[PDB]
Amino acid sequence: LSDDFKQISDPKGYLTYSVKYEDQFTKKDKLRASEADDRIVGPTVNLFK
Amino acid sequence: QHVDAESIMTAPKGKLFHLQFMDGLLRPEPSAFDPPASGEDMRLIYPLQP
C-alpha cells in the first residue's frame, strides 16, 4: 500500500569526520596493521594518520 | 672512507691509513615533531690522543 521506506545496507549519517593532514609528516605509507584488525580498526586509523 | 677494522686491526706495521672523524656541531636538530628513525650509528675506533 504505502510504499514509504527504501531499503539500504550501509547507511550514511548527516555528519562525518573531515581531517586535514599536515603533509610534512604522515608518510602516506597508509599504515598496515594486522589483517583481521586491519578491518576492524581499518579506516579510523587510515583516516587519523 | 670507513677504515674497515679488518685491516685497521691487521695491516703492515707501516701503512699510514687516513681514518676520518665527523665534526657534529653544525648538525641539524631533527624537526620537533617528525617520527623517529631506529639504528643508532656508532664508531668503533677513537683517536687515542687529542
Side-chain angles (χ1 to χ4, degrees):
Chain A
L1 300 186
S2 304
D3 303 2
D4 300 300
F5 284 150
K6 45 185 190 56
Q7 333 266 0
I8 62 180
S9 300
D10 300 300
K12 309 99 118 302
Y14 314 125
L15 286 173
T16 180
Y17 279 124
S18 290
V19 302
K20 307 183 63 177
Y21 312 118
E22 202 295 63
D23 300 300
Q24 175 79 306
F25 335 56
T26 75
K27 287 60 192 168
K28 299 180 180 182
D29 185 60
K30 305 173 187 176
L31 203 171
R32 278 292 189 61
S34 309
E35 197 180 0
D37 303 0
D38 180 359
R39 349 280 273 290
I40 302 180
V41 177
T44 300
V45 177
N46 278 0
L47 190 57
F48 300 30
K49 292 201 303 295
Chain B
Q1 235 53 80
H2 299 297
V3 177
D4 301 359
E6 223 180 359
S7 60
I8 183 180
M9 185 69 254
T10 59
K13 195 276 287 58
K15 193 181 198 315
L16 189 279
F17 31 53
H18 177 200
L19 70 60
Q20 64 189 198
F21 305 96
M22 182 73 127
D23 184 61
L25 168 35
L26 289 287
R27 20 152 63 287
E29 186 180 60
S31 187
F33 289 116
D34 186 67
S38 60
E40 345 65 1
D41 306 1
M42 56 262 270
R43 70 174 308 95
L44 175 152
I45 62 180
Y46 300 86
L48 180 47
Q49 61 187 66

